Amino acid sequence: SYQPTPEDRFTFGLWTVGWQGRDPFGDATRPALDPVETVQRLAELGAHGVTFHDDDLIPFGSSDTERESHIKRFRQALDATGMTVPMATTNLFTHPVFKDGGFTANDRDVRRYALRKTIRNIDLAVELGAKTYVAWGGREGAESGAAKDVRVALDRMKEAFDLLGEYVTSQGYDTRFAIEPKPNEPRGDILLPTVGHALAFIERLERPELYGVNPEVGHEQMAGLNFPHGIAQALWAGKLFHIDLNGQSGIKYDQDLRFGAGDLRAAFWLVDLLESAGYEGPRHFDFKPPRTEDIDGVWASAAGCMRNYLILKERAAAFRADPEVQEALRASRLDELAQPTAADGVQELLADRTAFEDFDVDAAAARGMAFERLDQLAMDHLLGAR
Amino acid sequence: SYQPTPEDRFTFGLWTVGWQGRDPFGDATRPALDPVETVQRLAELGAHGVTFHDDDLIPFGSSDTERESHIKRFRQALDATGMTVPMATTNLFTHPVFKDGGFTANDRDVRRYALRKTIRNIDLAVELGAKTYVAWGGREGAESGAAKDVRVALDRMKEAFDLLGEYVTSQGYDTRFAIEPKPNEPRGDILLPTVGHALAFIERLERPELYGVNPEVGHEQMAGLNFPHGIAQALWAGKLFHIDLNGQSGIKYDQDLRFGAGDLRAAFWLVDLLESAGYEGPRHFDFKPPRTEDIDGVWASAAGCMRNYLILKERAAAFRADPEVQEALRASRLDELAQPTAADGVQELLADRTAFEDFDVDAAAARGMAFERLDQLAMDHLLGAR
Amino acid sequence: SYQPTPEDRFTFGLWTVGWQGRDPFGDATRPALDPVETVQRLAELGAHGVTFHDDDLIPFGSSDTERESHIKRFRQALDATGMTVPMATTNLFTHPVFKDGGFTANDRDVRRYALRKTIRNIDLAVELGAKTYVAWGGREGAESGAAKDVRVALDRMKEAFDLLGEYVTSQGYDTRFAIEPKPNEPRGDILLPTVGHALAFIERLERPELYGVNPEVGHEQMAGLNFPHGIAQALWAGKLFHIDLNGQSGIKYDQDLRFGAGDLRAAFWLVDLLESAGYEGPRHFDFKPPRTEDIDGVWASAAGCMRNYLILKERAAAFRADPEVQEALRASRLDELAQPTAADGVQELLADRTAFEDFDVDAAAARGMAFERLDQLAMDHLLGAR
Amino acid sequence: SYQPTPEDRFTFGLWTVGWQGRDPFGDATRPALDPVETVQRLAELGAHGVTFHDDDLIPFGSSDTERESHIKRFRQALDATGMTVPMATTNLFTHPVFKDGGFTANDRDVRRYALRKTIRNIDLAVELGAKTYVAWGGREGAESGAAKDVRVALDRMKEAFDLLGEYVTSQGYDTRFAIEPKPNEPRGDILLPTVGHALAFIERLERPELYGVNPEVGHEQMAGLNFPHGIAQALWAGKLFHIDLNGQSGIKYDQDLRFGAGDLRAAFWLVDLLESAGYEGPRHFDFKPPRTEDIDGVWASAAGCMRNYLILKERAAAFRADPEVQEALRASRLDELAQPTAADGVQELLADRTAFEDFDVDAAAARGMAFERLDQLAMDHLLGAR
Ligand SMILES: [Mg+2]
Ligand SMILES: [Mg+2]
Ligand SMILES: [Mg+2]
Ligand SMILES: [Mg+2]
Ligand SMILES: [Mg+2]
Ligand SMILES: [Mg+2]
Ligand SMILES: [Mg+2]
Ligand SMILES: [Mg+2]
Ligand SMILES: [O-]
Ligand SMILES: [O-]
Ligand SMILES: [O-]
Ligand SMILES: [O-]
């Protein structure tokens, strides 16, 4: 089975299946896809909805009449298919004017233009029903040390987000923001490089409750971090507003492989976490079909994204349901991890001799954790060898 | 010149110059140093003070009389040399009982013991005059996915730090805590893996003002991150309580090279930031003299740490003082980065046609940033070619 | 399920299940294992043989009488179980005399001592039946640039291996040598860091036929390289003499996880390669049971190594046997890669206008490669969803 | 200061200063440069020559008449300046027909076309005076495991290079070939990923003498390797035919920063090696002026490449000439590494009791190597603090 239906909340950006295959060393290997045809083809595949950057839907520099016309025909395909727009974003990285950033460009006039460009697209995203507005500052950063004073750049980043927070509050919009972290590329180093850095930054904004994170699998893996661990921290903070799924095979350039490819065990632990934590947002795929592929390989790749999530969902649920796994978890004391360390308080802990002076350190040091047996049960379930 | 004096606030852990050279594949190549002799030799080198883990000063398992005796003779060398103890920490990673962690061990009784072990050493660190108490959770984490539920582990981590916050508040101690992030090693992945992750975690503690970060050069570089950028975020947050200086040559095992070795340009931008931001805490070295070295190579390595900071301090100050550099910074518009984007407010920005409808995008896109000329002036000053 | 047999050629080092758990930040968590108990327990698990470093078997410093006793007891356990010894190696990294190397130490006398220690163990390995003698220069390298002139050190490395070749040739021994590459750890950089570098060096020895490589999964992955691609090149060269199997989750310290853990798709493509190329040597596991484990967890991790190889062997055989995969391989023109580019020579090619002057570049550019549809069939077979 | 002369052999690719700034997330920021203006401007800066890909000089698709005109104008600028063309290469990566490779494309016809396109440019390079023809197989590789059988692809790679060797031998051309390794990007994994892998492959060609390597600083650093060590092995092998100089700050996308930027101490040890080994080929810069720059910044970045090499050349010469460094090298026994381990052979060594039976292992283990004191002298010379 593993057939996606709308109920599975699978979404795709216009820019993913529509990537023409232009990379740093080569030209486009595929023609551009029309936005109406992408909506059509994804609804046929079992997708729930689509997302967009403003310049994906409306070619940069369009007159107001060309814009209207682009939004009308898109909105029509959405009505015709039952497709939703859960999220939208701004392109603040392609046009040469953003070569030193959008919100943190050294030129003040470019920072003002970046904000107006964003605000215009927040109005459109709300009209189309988007609840989450993503911000990926891919050009915010530097290749050299004196080019960007980072404390002042963070003053300008906080100013920009506070300004957008005031704007949606004044308009009464029901939209929240999600910051997408990336450690590098296209800049040598990008500001707010990981989930952690974006979550700490949010706590310094004027209205923190309006902002969360949109982590991407491949981005945290570009810094060699454990993506399931970063998502668990964002969930613990109540800040996982959206998530971008794809694959990455290690620390190198950002590959955007289809979900499931790259680190397959990390994809298994991520699905197990999303499903057991009850995440209810879109399962969004931000990937690129390899430029070796024609348009049928594009839809084959898009279908494999959804198929791999559904296969892993089944294996993670079977794992957690297994009495032998529930037994191995008690053996590794994951139940004791859930008990408070000292709900009796610091003064009872300090007067407790079994916690220190009479604690038998070597009896405790000799208890094996039985983590390898547990992990081989997880490997067996992933591989269907049970 | 480049001669360290106490005034330069250079500090060293007992565990740094005293590392015997035991690594994963080999035995100790040097004898243990007595703590009194380390104090002596570092005061002679121009060091301001020393730090310790409890088990560095008092051998694990010492009776109360062996403990008293170890603290008396140490305290005596400190009085005799004028050496200070600015910071202290707990060893919650060497003894086998901490094989699954201290504060986040799955076994509850080990988590209670880890807290009592810590509290006993907070009392001693306050008595010796330490103002900062560092927490490096090196055993908090996992090699496999089901071994550690990370949301619950963070419940236990927050519980532990809140418990220590209540303890020092109740005792009226003037000590703050600093969390030291590390992405991996000795665990496959460590919780709170970077500066960003530790800063976001602190905002969820009961008394956030009691906690900051103690970043280490080599640790952020093990995730390929820009260490000067991470320190700028911690300074912007008002959370840089302490800093550990050393060298790392890339993403690999944690090398702990002497400061200045590893990424030399990153060391130059770090000193430029510390000195221009007015950091006033200790310049602490957490490094390991290579096990190829005898005890004279140990003191040669320790002296090079301080010499390299003083050379880079001089080159960074000369750079910033140069009128030609001040001119290149105006040319790259670092002065415009300091201007507010929209102090006129969102409604004036929205009614400003020069910010969007009449903005000349291509005139702005054509302005070069002159960042390469600026960076070659920084290279010239670093190398003393001006 | 999936039982290990004799004919599977699974072997283990004495140092793998015998690892006591000591790492750079912690003490041993397990008791030392007796070599004869290791032989017994591994025979019980379905292993075909065991390997050893000389100091695993005979304690460094044992007179020629305890050496006698140690070899006698050990050979007894092998006699009793039918266990074989396919390979042996020298420990030229643990003792402090090897702190700057064995074969390439700057001190001449340490290099002579290193060669005498190796030759003593080549005699023992041959009489126990080993056909392959592994060299892992863990200490050959540097933490700094002027400490080691690498061209001269390669002269010394070549000299050591040529002298070893002369010795086994004058003795008439059947044994061949296999270099084990590793990019770093315990040295900042190790000489002959990858499979590629070791294959090139072998070509400069006086008897290249006596020497091949012994690549390890996690070591090539410490440099972010594709381990199956590196094994395909060692097999193309006719130099894959032995292989070390384990797991690694990224570029970081050497983990030595059990085979299957780490990069699970790389383990699948490795098994598919080994089995389709008909590699017939030992499937040797060089891994470390995590120090979180007691001795039951050690045997559970050793059994998981074998189980994972056998599950992947079955999934890879099913992938290649599937008629739809054979069809997808023809569709991606994997059969056409096996056809010679220009079997009728360079003047044939130059005289062919369809190769240049009349080649339709756009029709060729538009053929899709259908690689994503082939990779999802491989993904379905691995996960048993086919 | 530090002026570039002719005799310094500094060369640049047409594609380096000519890079228009287009990357995977952004459009070109600079106008295209005319090849004759590039020749003029670089002659003015003190460059000795220029290099080119065939499609840098002649637009893909130009008839044999625009080809004529393009070569004529270009040769005119060279005639007028005295600029030389030391090396040339083929673009087998930009056009979509090369999406799965040139020499190792699965389609036979694309491989024939790739060889005809290369041979056409070998004829042009020879008449312009190039002695080295570089091959960079940027598209040779895969993003997935069954897309490319690597043993067969190495058969095709060897076949392509053997046919090129036959062609230049039957023409009597003086030119030699140089393989440029790169571990990844634009392919997930590229074949012959490091200097080591390319040196081993060369040993399997029918005429190994015609082929060497062209390593690039940032490409070996993309795999975390030590670039000076890799160059020492290519020089030991007699295969350093050419070298590409630039900067890279870590394992991430290929940056191509100007030489000196990135890992500055690695650039110091590289210059020290090149100058002490008497390398006499071009010092070629393969870098990209950041897209933040206008054309004045492009020429400022190109001048910085040359300046940095000349400052490092001077600092490295001063380090080796210093009597205290010569003394520190004797103290670290760098003179003793040059002495043969056992010049009087294996039976000499076996008969020597001072090599084993009477060698005092503890006195040898306790000699310190004094490597930190030597490295701080190197650090003092680099920073001009001596
Ligand atoms: Mg991405
Ligand atoms: Mg994304
Ligand atoms: Mg460290
Ligand atoms: Mg530290
Ligand atoms: Mg290993
Ligand atoms: Mg091994
Ligand atoms: Mg490059
Ligand atoms: Mg190059
Ligand atoms: O992305
Ligand atoms: O450390
Ligand atoms: O290993
Ligand atoms: O490049």
Side-chain angles (χ1 to χ4, degrees), chain A residues 5-20:
Chain A
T5 59
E7 218 161 293
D8 303 327
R9 298 163 297 197
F10 290 136
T11 63
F12 295 80
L14 288 189
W15 70 90
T16 63
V17 291
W19 179 57
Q20 293 182 251

PDB file of all heavy atoms in Angstrom, chain A residues 5-20:
ATOM      1  N   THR A   5      -2.577  10.096   0.603  1.00  0.00           N
ATOM      2  CA  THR A   5      -3.868  10.731   0.395  1.00  0.00           C
ATOM      3  C   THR A   5      -3.746  12.121   1.009  1.00  0.00           C
ATOM      4  O   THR A   5      -2.882  12.313   1.869  1.00  0.00           O
ATOM      5  CB  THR A   5      -5.032  10.002   1.114  1.00  0.00           C
ATOM      6  OG1 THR A   5      -4.701  10.000   2.493  1.00  0.00           O
ATOM      7  CG2 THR A   5      -5.314   8.625   0.533  1.00  0.00           C
ATOM      8  N   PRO A   6      -4.616  13.100   0.730  1.00  0.00           N
ATOM      9  CA  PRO A   6      -4.586  14.436   1.340  1.00  0.00           C
ATOM     10  C   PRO A   6      -4.484  14.492   2.849  1.00  0.00           C
ATOM     11  O   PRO A   6      -3.940  15.439   3.425  1.00  0.00           O
ATOM     12  CB  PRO A   6      -5.852  15.096   0.828  1.00  0.00           C
ATOM     13  CG  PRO A   6      -6.052  14.457  -0.521  1.00  0.00           C
ATOM     14  CD  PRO A   6      -5.750  13.003  -0.204  1.00  0.00           C
ATOM     15  N   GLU A   7      -5.005  13.432   3.457  1.00  0.00           N
ATOM     16  CA  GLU A   7      -5.073  13.285   4.898  1.00  0.00           C
ATOM     17  C   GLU A   7      -3.696  13.224   5.523  1.00  0.00           C
ATOM     18  O   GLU A   7      -3.529  13.599   6.681  1.00  0.00           O
ATOM     19  CB  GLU A   7      -5.853  12.019   5.221  1.00  0.00           C
ATOM     20  CG  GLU A   7      -6.716  12.247   6.438  1.00  0.00           C
ATOM     21  CD  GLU A   7      -7.858  11.241   6.602  1.00  0.00           C
ATOM     22  OE1 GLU A   7      -8.790  11.247   5.778  1.00  0.00           O
ATOM     23  OE2 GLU A   7      -7.825  10.462   7.569  1.00  0.00           O
ATOM     24  N   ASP A   8      -2.700  12.773   4.746  1.00  0.00           N
ATOM     25  CA  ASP A   8      -1.328  12.688   5.224  1.00  0.00           C
ATOM     26  C   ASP A   8      -0.558  14.024   5.289  1.00  0.00           C
ATOM     27  O   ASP A   8       0.596  14.061   5.741  1.00  0.00           O
ATOM     28  CB  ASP A   8      -0.601  11.682   4.339  1.00  0.00           C
ATOM     29  CG  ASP A   8      -1.212  10.269   4.283  1.00  0.00           C
ATOM     30  OD1 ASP A   8      -1.778   9.795   5.262  1.00  0.00           O
ATOM     31  OD2 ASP A   8      -1.117   9.628   3.249  1.00  0.00           O
ATOM     32  N   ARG A   9      -1.194  15.139   4.857  1.00  0.00           N
ATOM     33  CA  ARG A   9      -0.641  16.501   4.938  1.00  0.00           C
ATOM     34  C   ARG A   9       0.727  16.707   4.285  1.00  0.00           C
ATOM     35  O   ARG A   9       1.583  17.465   4.745  1.00  0.00           O
ATOM     36  CB  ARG A   9      -0.580  16.956   6.429  1.00  0.00           C
ATOM     37  CG  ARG A   9      -1.918  17.050   7.159  1.00  0.00           C
ATOM     38  CD  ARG A   9      -1.722  17.094   8.682  1.00  0.00           C
ATOM     39  NE  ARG A   9      -1.099  15.866   9.197  1.00  0.00           N
ATOM     40  CZ  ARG A   9      -1.103  15.469  10.497  1.00  0.00           C
ATOM     41  NH1 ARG A   9      -1.689  16.177  11.472  1.00  0.00           N
ATOM     42  NH2 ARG A   9      -0.516  14.305  10.832  1.00  0.00           N
ATOM     43  N   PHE A  10       0.930  16.036   3.168  1.00  0.00           N
ATOM     44  CA  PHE A  10       2.144  16.174   2.403  1.00  0.00           C
ATOM     45  C   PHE A  10       2.110  17.415   1.526  1.00  0.00           C
ATOM     46  O   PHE A  10       1.174  17.593   0.756  1.00  0.00           O
ATOM     47  CB  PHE A  10       2.379  14.914   1.526  1.00  0.00           C
ATOM     48  CG  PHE A  10       2.754  13.655   2.331  1.00  0.00           C
ATOM     49  CD1 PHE A  10       2.161  12.450   2.013  1.00  0.00           C
ATOM     50  CD2 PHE A  10       3.685  13.714   3.366  1.00  0.00           C
ATOM     51  CE1 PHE A  10       2.503  11.323   2.730  1.00  0.00           C
ATOM     52  CE2 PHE A  10       4.020  12.593   4.080  1.00  0.00           C
ATOM     53  CZ  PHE A  10       3.418  11.393   3.752  1.00  0.00           C
ATOM     54  N   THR A  11       3.117  18.302   1.655  1.00  0.00           N
ATOM     55  CA  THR A  11       3.183  19.496   0.846  1.00  0.00           C
ATOM     56  C   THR A  11       4.546  19.653   0.156  1.00  0.00           C
ATOM     57  O   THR A  11       5.553  19.043   0.523  1.00  0.00           O
ATOM     58  CB  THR A  11       2.872  20.765   1.687  1.00  0.00           C
ATOM     59  OG1 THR A  11       3.883  20.891   2.682  1.00  0.00           O
ATOM     60  CG2 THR A  11       1.492  20.707   2.343  1.00  0.00           C
ATOM     61  N   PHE A  12       4.554  20.439  -0.918  1.00  0.00           N
ATOM     62  CA  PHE A  12       5.739  20.601  -1.741  1.00  0.00           C
ATOM     63  C   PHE A  12       5.820  22.057  -2.175  1.00  0.00           C
ATOM     64  O   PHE A  12       4.799  22.704  -2.447  1.00  0.00           O
ATOM     65  CB  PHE A  12       5.701  19.725  -3.024  1.00  0.00           C
ATOM     66  CG  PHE A  12       5.714  18.200  -2.838  1.00  0.00           C
ATOM     67  CD1 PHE A  12       4.549  17.497  -2.499  1.00  0.00           C
ATOM     68  CD2 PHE A  12       6.890  17.489  -2.993  1.00  0.00           C
ATOM     69  CE1 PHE A  12       4.554  16.122  -2.319  1.00  0.00           C
ATOM     70  CE2 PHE A  12       6.895  16.105  -2.812  1.00  0.00           C
ATOM     71  CZ  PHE A  12       5.727  15.427  -2.479  1.00  0.00           C
ATOM     72  N   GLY A  13       7.051  22.600  -2.219  1.00  0.00           N
ATOM     73  CA  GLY A  13       7.215  23.928  -2.765  1.00  0.00           C
ATOM     74  C   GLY A  13       7.139  23.918  -4.278  1.00  0.00           C
ATOM     75  O   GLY A  13       7.491  22.920  -4.917  1.00  0.00           O
ATOM     76  N   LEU A  14       6.691  25.034  -4.878  1.00  0.00           N
ATOM     77  CA  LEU A  14       6.713  25.213  -6.328  1.00  0.00           C
ATOM     78  C   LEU A  14       8.103  25.083  -6.924  1.00  0.00           C
ATOM     79  O   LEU A  14       8.315  24.504  -7.980  1.00  0.00           O
ATOM     80  CB  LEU A  14       6.161  26.589  -6.724  1.00  0.00           C
ATOM     81  CG  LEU A  14       4.641  26.843  -6.578  1.00  0.00           C
ATOM     82  CD1 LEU A  14       4.326  28.179  -7.239  1.00  0.00           C
ATOM     83  CD2 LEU A  14       3.819  25.737  -7.247  1.00  0.00           C
ATOM     84  N   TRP A  15       9.074  25.513  -6.125  1.00  0.00           N
ATOM     85  CA  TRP A  15      10.492  25.484  -6.456  1.00  0.00           C
ATOM     86  C   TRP A  15      11.206  24.120  -6.394  1.00  0.00           C
ATOM     87  O   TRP A  15      12.391  24.019  -6.767  1.00  0.00           O
ATOM     88  CB  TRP A  15      11.187  26.461  -5.503  1.00  0.00           C
ATOM     89  CG  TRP A  15      11.247  25.993  -4.029  1.00  0.00           C
ATOM     90  CD1 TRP A  15      12.310  25.244  -3.568  1.00  0.00           C
ATOM     91  CD2 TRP A  15      10.357  26.312  -3.019  1.00  0.00           C
ATOM     92  NE1 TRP A  15      12.107  25.111  -2.286  1.00  0.00           N
ATOM     93  CE2 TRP A  15      10.968  25.723  -1.915  1.00  0.00           C
ATOM     94  CE3 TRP A  15       9.171  27.011  -2.887  1.00  0.00           C
ATOM     95  CZ2 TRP A  15      10.389  25.833  -0.670  1.00  0.00           C
ATOM     96  CZ3 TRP A  15       8.599  27.127  -1.640  1.00  0.00           C
ATOM     97  CH2 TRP A  15       9.196  26.546  -0.545  1.00  0.00           C
ATOM     98  N   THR A  16      10.542  23.091  -5.839  1.00  0.00           N
ATOM     99  CA  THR A  16      11.139  21.769  -5.653  1.00  0.00           C
ATOM    100  C   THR A  16      11.048  20.995  -6.973  1.00  0.00           C
ATOM    101  O   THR A  16      12.042  20.914  -7.738  1.00  0.00           O
ATOM    102  CB  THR A  16      10.394  21.031  -4.450  1.00  0.00           C
ATOM    103  OG1 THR A  16       9.011  20.821  -4.745  1.00  0.00           O
ATOM    104  CG2 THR A  16      10.502  21.875  -3.173  1.00  0.00           C
ATOM    105  N   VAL A  17       9.832  20.482  -7.316  1.00  0.00           N
ATOM    106  CA  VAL A  17       9.642  19.722  -8.574  1.00  0.00           C
ATOM    107  C   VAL A  17       9.874  20.635  -9.787  1.00  0.00           C
ATOM    108  O   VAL A  17      10.236  20.185 -10.868  1.00  0.00           O
ATOM    109  CB  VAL A  17       8.173  19.049  -8.626  1.00  0.00           C
ATOM    110  CG1 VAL A  17       8.135  17.964  -7.581  1.00  0.00           C
ATOM    111  CG2 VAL A  17       7.022  20.024  -8.327  1.00  0.00           C
ATOM    112  N   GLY A  18       9.746  21.961  -9.601  1.00  0.00           N
ATOM    113  CA  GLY A  18       9.963  22.915 -10.668  1.00  0.00           C
ATOM    114  C   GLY A  18      11.402  23.367 -10.809  1.00  0.00           C
ATOM    115  O   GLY A  18      11.638  24.275 -11.607  1.00  0.00           O
ATOM    116  N   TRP A  19      12.371  22.831 -10.048  1.00  0.00           N
ATOM    117  CA  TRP A  19      13.792  23.184 -10.197  1.00  0.00           C
ATOM    118  C   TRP A  19      14.284  22.755 -11.585  1.00  0.00           C
ATOM    119  O   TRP A  19      14.162  21.602 -11.985  1.00  0.00           O
ATOM    120  CB  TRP A  19      14.641  22.494  -9.098  1.00  0.00           C
ATOM    121  CG  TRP A  19      16.145  22.780  -9.177  1.00  0.00           C
ATOM    122  CD1 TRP A  19      16.648  24.061  -9.145  1.00  0.00           C
ATOM    123  CD2 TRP A  19      17.148  21.837  -9.272  1.00  0.00           C
ATOM    124  NE1 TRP A  19      17.964  23.924  -9.220  1.00  0.00           N
ATOM    125  CE2 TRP A  19      18.303  22.622  -9.289  1.00  0.00           C
ATOM    126  CE3 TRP A  19      17.250  20.469  -9.335  1.00  0.00           C
ATOM    127  CZ2 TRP A  19      19.566  22.038  -9.367  1.00  0.00           C
ATOM    128  CZ3 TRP A  19      18.502  19.888  -9.414  1.00  0.00           C
ATOM    129  CH2 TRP A  19      19.656  20.660  -9.430  1.00  0.00           C
ATOM    130  N   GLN A  20      14.834  23.681 -12.376  1.00  0.00           N
ATOM    131  CA  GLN A  20      15.275  23.352 -13.715  1.00  0.00           C
ATOM    132  C   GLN A  20      16.635  22.708 -13.752  1.00  0.00           C
ATOM    133  O   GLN A  20      17.063  22.295 -14.824  1.00  0.00           O
ATOM    134  CB  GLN A  20      15.299  24.584 -14.537  1.00  0.00           C
ATOM    135  CG  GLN A  20      13.903  25.103 -14.744  1.00  0.00           C
ATOM    136  CD  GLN A  20      13.939  26.328 -15.629  1.00  0.00           C
ATOM    137  OE1 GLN A  20      13.697  27.430 -15.154  1.00  0.00           O
ATOM    138  NE2 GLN A  20      14.257  26.185 -16.919  1.00  0.00           N
TER     139      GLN A  20
END
